[model samples]
Target: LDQILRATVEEVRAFLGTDRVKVYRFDPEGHGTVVAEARGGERLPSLLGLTFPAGDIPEEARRLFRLAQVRVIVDVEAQSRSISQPESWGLSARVPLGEPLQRPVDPCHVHYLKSMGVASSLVVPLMHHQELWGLLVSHHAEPRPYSQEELQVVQLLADQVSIAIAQAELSL
Candidate 1:
């Protein structure tokens, strides 16, 4: 049921303590629809009911990324904003655990998330059978790091959602 995914996104946003969490489902044609969302605060824009063209996500990234277990991306830009700075969940990424960003990211992707004011994100694909179903995405407005334990939790969440899809379409 849709309630299952709605609740799951809310729980994930809380669990990750991220700025935004969304369930982006892909249609057969590869277009994406944001069906569910949970926001940590009003800083991030609401994407619910937004339909994205297939080209919004390149075909190659979508294809290769679907083969992944867990993907973490960090945009290391020092963004300037007028909003008051609050406590950083990750605290510059290095103060807590993982390395922040010594490595460079794809220029295009960097531009994309930058344009959206997303500094970092962790993504887990939802699989149905052998095909990609959707993506569970956690976006952070501030640059952040993900711990091993946190990544493990998200991995399990993705598998559970895969099975949830399996159960949902049985009667259809």
Candidate 2:
């Protein structure tokens, strides 16, 4: 069952030309676990079979994830503040991310991402039939900001991947 989902996800990640991809399923007791992974480019493969307890992510960060639905971090600078947002947007209001607000992740979170050679990242919710099941994440080794159009394209990919997973589940 999971194998089928992994296979379908791998195809989507490959088609997206992503450096690395991971599907993280939330575990009620063990936090979120990397359920499937596919790698490309020069990025190192992540802890594919590893599990990060819910305690691994701070409450504040988790709140952001729940509210944001998608989290996009463009770069990781040691000197940068813990605030996930950058000031270059010129808007005094909150940084916009489509209909959802995209909150910045903490610098420590960025460091974790960089350890895997990821200079940028986007965490998209894997929603099927309006229920959040997991996350589809992509990482880049250099500072890269995904445009609104780029995000829409990526979201489309995510939707397809989630459907594939659901289909796999039904088949099983």
Candidate 3:
């Protein structure tokens, strides 16, 4: 049903090099739709066509996406049996995301992913018409130290996705 979105995410999946890459589109009701996704193997389950409650991503989180507009990485089991918690032209962070965000991604969100077998995660906003149309995501079972070079590339990929949606506006 979302062939274009599917291809778009697959393109990022390859470049981002993750266990799972997905396009999560928002709905008016505060919920989200997994419009498309690509995975390297069966380690992660497919979320395509599924719906998630708005509570899954509160308004504050959505607002951060608009302002941060960069990448937010999550590292679960960050301290093992303990607890825990960017840069210019993007977002500033003491380290990269997950050391603790400038305003940290909610701890619940981290725990949220842990339940899904995700040790590492990446999130990029997909802005269309200056508002959040959806998000680009990477979920991994292994922790990856993503570089700025690597992180910047995903933004380009997301921009391309923005272009992909632009075409729909023109064509549809």
Candidate 4:
């Protein structure tokens, strides 16, 4: 069950054409186990069985995961300073996609993206019977705000993942 669902997740990640898709399943211990993972570019180690403390989970991501929706990081830098909005996906957000950033993002996120070569990420929660079973993360190499349509597709994909995980658990 794990293998089949993991393969389906990999195929979905490839379909998104993003950097990678990482799904973290919460363990009974104070750690999260990477039950599935897939990437678009370079060779990254499989994070399966990797464990980390629950504190390592991003607070914003945790909040969104509880809400069972898509949370975007459009401007990782500018949003960092704003107390009212502490997080942004590192790109100027235009949900409908008809607008553009008036000012270029500070050299920070771009340089950081170039140095690390990753920008923009969308995190979607997988819910099973109204409970969060895991999360799907999609990252891009450049800072481009996701369109509403893209978010819709991601949400649909997340729902499918939630259903698959539930079925797998039943068979287990």
What would the per-residue lDDT of candidate 1 be over residues 1-172, giving only the tens digit for each residue?
4667888888767767777888887778667788798877677778898998887655534543544445556554643222222764332322322333232345666767777777776777787777777778877776455677867776787788788766866743
List candidate 3 stretches off by more than 4 Å: 79-103
Q: How much is the lDDT of residue 55 in candidate 1?
A: 76
Q: Which candidate order results from sorting by lDDT in descending order?
A: 3, 1, 2, 4
C-alpha RMSD (angstroms) for model 3: 5.9
Provide TM-scores for the models: 0.75, 0.73, 0.79, 0.70
Model 2 C-alpha lDDT per residue in residues 1-172, reported as the tens digit of each score: 3565577557767666676777877765657777788877645845678986777675555544544556666566533445544544333355433433345556667668767766667677776774656777777666355677777787687777777777766776
- Report the C-alpha lDDT of model 3 over 1-172, residue by residue, as the tens digit: 2678877777777667777888887767687888887878778677788998888754545655665677565466653232232222444544423334433455776677887788777878878776777677788877557677767766777887787776675776
Clashes of 4: 12
lDDT of 4 by residue, 46-94 (tens): 5566775787544553544454255555655443321225566445433
**For candidate 2, what is the TM-score?**
0.73
What's model 2's overall lDDT?
Answer: 0.65
Candidate 1 accuracy as TM-score: 0.75
Candidate 2 residues lying further than 4 Å off, grouped into runs, are: 78-80, 83-102, 129-131, 167-172
Which of 3 and 4 is ahead in lDDT?
Answer: 3
The clash count for each model shown is: 0, 1, 3, 12
Supply the TM-score for candidate 3.
0.79
Give per-residue lDDT, candidate 1, residue 6.
88
